[PDB]
Paper text:
Intriguingly, wild-type InlB392 was a much more problematic crystallization target than the InlB392_T332E variant. At 4°C we obtained thin rod-shaped crystals with a cross-section of about 10 × 10 µm and a length of 80–100 µm. In a way, the packing of InlB392_wt can be viewed as a slightly distorted version of InlB392_T332E crystal form I with a tripled b axis.
InlB, an invasion protein from the facultative intracellular pathogen Listeria monocytogenes, is a multi-domain protein that binds and activates the human receptor tyrosine kinase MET. The N-terminal internalin domain (amino acids 36–321; InlB321) is characterized by a central leucine-rich repeat (LRR) region that binds to the first Ig-like IPT domain of MET with high affinity. The B repeat folds into a compact domain resembling a β-grasp fold.
Author numbering: 36 to 391
């Protein structure tokens, strides 16, 4: 990883955009100009944001780089970084970098920015417990279990992700700046002990409940909790709903597949002021009851409209032969379970028998 003769910049740095970056850093006239290892050793910092760079191949010949600004490029592989032992600041916003394993030996890294990279798996960050700043906004992260090992972070941005479980942050008492907006957070109890916060953002939380059946009189528990576990009063409720603590209630005379409510709660933690803001969405299934009548005795089961009915075990009446399930006791037509789907209303099916 060392050149032994003067070598043109373009020969080492194969990406045309990155070659111009080295030329400009060294104040050279052309990417064809020859450079020496002593000149490469002199590079402490590279600033090449928004420069259409696809590859940093060649950077492994720069042992003394401590600061690397590469926001807004087209990078995917970062393996050439693997042995830059003195790298302290790495900014890789707006790329497509997913293989964080190349970072595992960068033990002097103090600041890491990886926003807008499509990342979901951050487990590779376990090898960087010394990090002080971490920017992971605009990604697809759900599991932040690993962050309990990052006990040196004072700055953490996780905004615009898919996080619901923030329990791994509870012990990270060094945090001073914490950006968590645009996530799925409904329970702030994990934040209660972060007494050193100065800046906190908690806006636009989208919280999705598991679906329940639609009913005429609907009750859904309020699941939004402050740092002390207390319920956050809804800011506004859809469909003319009302808040009857601890439950939100609606009268829905006609079926609808969703209700929702928005919440707002001012929050103070340590010296930090924040606005806890978000929406809880409740999907609803339209279910009705099939009643099976067997000579006056009925069993009822609930079935979603538009789905197939599972036929019950047929009744066995001595001296007769079961013929089918009919829409009326005396008369009507027979229900065909393989092709007729549950209707949008309650109804009864009647067992009919015939003589031997």
């Amino acid at each position: 990883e060392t050149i032994t003769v003067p070598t043109p910049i373009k020969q080492i740095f194969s990406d045309d955009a990155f070659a111009e970056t080295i030329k400009d850093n060294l104040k050279k006239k052309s990417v064809t100009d020859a450079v020496t290892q002593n000149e490469l050793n002199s590079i402490d910092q590279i600033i090449a944001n928004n420069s259409d760079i696809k590859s940093v191949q060649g950077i492994q010949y720069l042992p003394n780089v401590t600061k690397l600004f590469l926001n807004g490029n087209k990078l995917t592989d970062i393996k050439p970084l693997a042995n830059l032992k003195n790298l302290g600041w790495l900014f890789l916003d707006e790329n497509k970098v997913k293989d964080l394993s190349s970072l595992k030996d960068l033990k002097k890294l103090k600041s890491l920015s990886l926003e807008h990279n499509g990342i979901s798996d951050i487990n590779g960050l376990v090898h960087l417990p010394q990090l002080e700043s971490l920017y992971l906004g605009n990604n697809k992260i759900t599991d932040i279990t690993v962050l309990s090992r990052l006990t040196k972070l004072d700055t953490l941005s996780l905004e615009d992700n898919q996080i619901s479980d923030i329990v791994p942050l509870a012990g990270l008492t060094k945090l001073q700046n914490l950006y968590l907006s645009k996530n799925h957070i409904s329970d702030l109890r994990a934040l209660a002990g972060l007494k050193n916060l100065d800046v906190l953002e908690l806006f636009s939380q989208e919280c999705l409940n598991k679906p329940i059946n639609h009913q005429s009189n609907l009750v859904v528990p309020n699941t939004v909790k402050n740092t002390d576990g207390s319920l956050v009063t809804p800011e506004i409720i859809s469909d003319d709903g009302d808040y009857e603590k601890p439950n939100v209630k609606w009268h829905l005379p006609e079926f609808t597949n969703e209700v929702s409510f928005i919440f707002y709660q001012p929050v103070t933690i340590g010296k930090a002021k924040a606005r806890f803001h978000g929406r809880v969405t409740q999907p609803l299934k339209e279910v009705y009851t099939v009643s099976y009548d067997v000579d006056g005795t009925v069993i009822k089961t609930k079935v979603e409209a538009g789905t197939r009915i599972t036929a019950p075990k047929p009744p066995t009446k001595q001296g007769y032969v079961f013929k089918g399930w009919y829409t009326e006791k005396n008369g009507g037509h027979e229900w065909n379970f393989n092709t007729d789907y549950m209707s949008g209303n309650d109804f009864t099916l009647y067992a009919v028998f015939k003589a031997e």
